[PDB]
Design a protein around this ligand. Sequence first.
Ligand SMILES: CN(CCNc1ccnc2cc(Cl)ccc12)CCNc1ccnc2cc(Cl)ccc12
Lengths: 57, 338, 265, 228, 127
Amino acid sequence: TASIAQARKLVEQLKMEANIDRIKVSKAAADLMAYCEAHAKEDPLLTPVPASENPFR
Amino acid sequence: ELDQLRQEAEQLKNQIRDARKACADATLSQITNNIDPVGRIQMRTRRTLRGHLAKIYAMHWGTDSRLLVSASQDGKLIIWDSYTTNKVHAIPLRSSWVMTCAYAPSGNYVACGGLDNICSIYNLKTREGNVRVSRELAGHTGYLSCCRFLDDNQIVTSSGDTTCALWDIETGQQTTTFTGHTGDVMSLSLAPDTRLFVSGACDASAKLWDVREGMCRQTFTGHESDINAICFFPNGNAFATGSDDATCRLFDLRADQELMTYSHDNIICGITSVSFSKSGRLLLAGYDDFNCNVWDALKADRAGVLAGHDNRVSCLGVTDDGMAVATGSWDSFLKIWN
Amino acid sequence: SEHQQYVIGLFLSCLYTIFLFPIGFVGNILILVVNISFREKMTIPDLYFINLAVADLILVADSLIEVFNLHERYYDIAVLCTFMSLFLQVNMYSSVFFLTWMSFDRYIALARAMRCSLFRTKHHARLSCGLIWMASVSATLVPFTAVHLVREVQWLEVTLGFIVPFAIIGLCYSLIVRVLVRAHRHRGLRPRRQKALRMILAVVLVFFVCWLPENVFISVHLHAHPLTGHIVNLAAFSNSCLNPLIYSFLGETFRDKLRLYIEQK
Amino acid sequence: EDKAAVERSKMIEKQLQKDKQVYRRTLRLLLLGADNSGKSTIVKQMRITSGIFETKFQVDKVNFHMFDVGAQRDERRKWIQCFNDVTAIIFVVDSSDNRLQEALNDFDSIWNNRWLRTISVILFLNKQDLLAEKVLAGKSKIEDYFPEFARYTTPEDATPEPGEDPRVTRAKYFIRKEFVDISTASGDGRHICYPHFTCAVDTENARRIFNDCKDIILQMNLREYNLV
Amino acid sequence: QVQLQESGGGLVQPGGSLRLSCAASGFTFSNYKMNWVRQAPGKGLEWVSDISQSGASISYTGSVKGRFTISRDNAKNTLYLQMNSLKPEDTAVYYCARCPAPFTRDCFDVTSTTYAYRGQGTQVTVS
Ligand SMILES: CN(CCNc1ccnc2cc(Cl)ccc12)CCNc1ccnc2cc(Cl)ccc12
């Protein structure tokens, strides 16, 4: 009754997740690496900025 | 039929596992070995925001990168000006047990909630001058874990019950509900475009939701315990989850599987909060040993430590411009690091 | 007898500098550095402990000078000797008054805990420390100026630095012990509260035994007797030497703080 | 204007200082129990879709805010961490034997949690009259669920209420010892368990809580003053 | 994902003896305390037994003390419950529950109606 009600929706969700287009991990890793490389200069935390324009100094 | 449905679910889950394994032609570490390390990341405590009488459970930066709201379990949420340490507002709360707080992207409102199961929206731009409750969103049957504004009228809130909800602030009704989790939804992270959001619950799974349609697009597993925190990668194509199993994990939406795991042998305490730097190259994670660890998100080697707090680090947020990192703790102090 | 008494005095001095002096010096320095390093999370007792540590450090430091009779030199009565006398008197008064005020504040915290919460505030603690220092300075200067225009100075020393302080200490700690025993027989934790009673008794007894000799010696006369003066001064300095041990080392809270500080360092 | 900003900051700091006195004066308590336990009756005893209910009461001019979770799921590992700085946890148990093992497991989990490890627990062995009635009835046997009871005997230094049947004394002290064993098995003495035998008609539960909180505050002060 | 599969249990005569086994996958089995819970017909979830990470400390519910023996195999990532002299009351669905977090001494939610680290369970029936 209710157990099958939950199981049917679980199955439906699994079918929905199974049909999604999936890309190789290499492409995703390359995209993340390229994004981090592109914005390397724009991130103060790993590229410290002179105190003359640090708002906290 | 129950056995038949369980077998069908098992077959579909095996199919998903096989597809993920097939897509995993390489590991993120294998590719990030090519790039040099981020080096030592040493950050100093530029500001210490005092004024809270109890634990700071949550905080959120304003979009302007200057004003930030912090909620404490003494029944108070304070809007500070970080640059000068001045407290712009000190809103008293109806319920002392506030577990989350949000700052509207326009800066006009703030939101909070907790064990009261109610999301209170406060109007900062009130003509009367004194902040007053603009709205009180009710309908959740469990403690409110997190909340985030999409606009001045829409807010997504995750609850101690197994559901999230997108509300209409003007009407105060749940515009849509997101169901599918099995435990308490502990964290919530809006995508940069606000079209999708990821929620981590008190199980191994974190789910991706489309705010328009209202269904779970993907479910990511790999964590061994509760997912206490979640944050979206700056480009929106990946997210990091911190869990009670003492490990962080970076998942990718397109690959639909774990991409990297950040952990160390001597780290045997849970993770309370995670966030990414502006570039996404650093992943900052607060721990139950009350010191935050800055991980190289790509090489997954601890790049730095922020050990200024004396009690559990409960919240951690990086500024929109990436100029500082605000960490709150159960010692009732918020510290800005830079 | 003169040679024998001189040798006995030097032997007592050697014993003191070997055993008691390291306790006072090292313990006061450790208390000061440990409490200051953790300034961001100091409690009300820590303020009084810090000030008492300062006073005891000064007194024990002067002990070494007094031990080898280096004070009988470079008098310069116009400036140096008078300044040293005033400084040591204010340090002694600060030590005694901080012991008395710590006893009273302990009574407030352990008997009026739930009602006098407003009284006990860290800002109020700092104000109390300042007022204690001011009271010591005034008690030192006022008699000095009055007799400038000494028996009266010694009278004030004896009375205001042993009789009233000891009376207050005894009353406050008797009340604390009454509270502890009353709450001991009903719901309290037996072993740790027995330990607390032992600590209170040790504090009271060490203060009494260390400060009674010199005060009684002053009262009896109110030169001569070199050995007696030497031993009473040694006991007076031993009070400050032992204060850090009983107040901080013997207590679990400060030992935990010290272990945490070592781990941090 | 920065001067107006600093003026507003000073106003807000003055408000925070004013409310800090109220926060420090008040004592916060967390009321825990099960469905069978009469925690609601304990709440209603004190004559001075919501997720939590607060009750304000006063004893000897000191103010207590007692919090009882309302609409929450049974899984409590996450929302209980909010109560890691309360003065005490009032644990109410249905002492009439059976869910006693469930209550013992709940007490053990509360005691050994990493965040409640420094919080003392006031243990109300509630519904003592029902326990007495069913022990005198003889239909139910405690040894069925706790075989150790078949060997346990009341300690020679017991303090039975005058006129109490020794069987009731044995049963009640056996349950109390069962809870105290978990209490003392760990904790290294930084937090204490205060067992009390309570009923629905009892009118001194507020006095019990006040006295236990007085002892808890005494222990806190004694620890901060380095005396322990 | 975290998965627990109870491989054992079945029909038995009164006074018999069975051996329930649970295989645990998806997590470091050694770091987590383990517990056996059971749900009888018409009853709520009942906590039966508990075994720590190393197996040094064990605990049972009084109704089964002396009859059930809980054991752990970290190498095989398996949890066993050897049940002896089974009474008719023992008939129930037995689940193997995991401690919510690793290295912790508290096991809050193992007996909840919905728990994310509990297996589907195995039915044990006594004639
Ligand atoms: C108080 N002592 C030494 C004073 N030295 C201190 C100065 C400043 N501060 C101090 C603090 C402390 Cl704790 C202890 C000592 C001092 C009196 C002993 N002086 C005497 C020596 C020889 N003959 C005497 C004859 C008489 Cl009739 C009276 C006194 C005589």
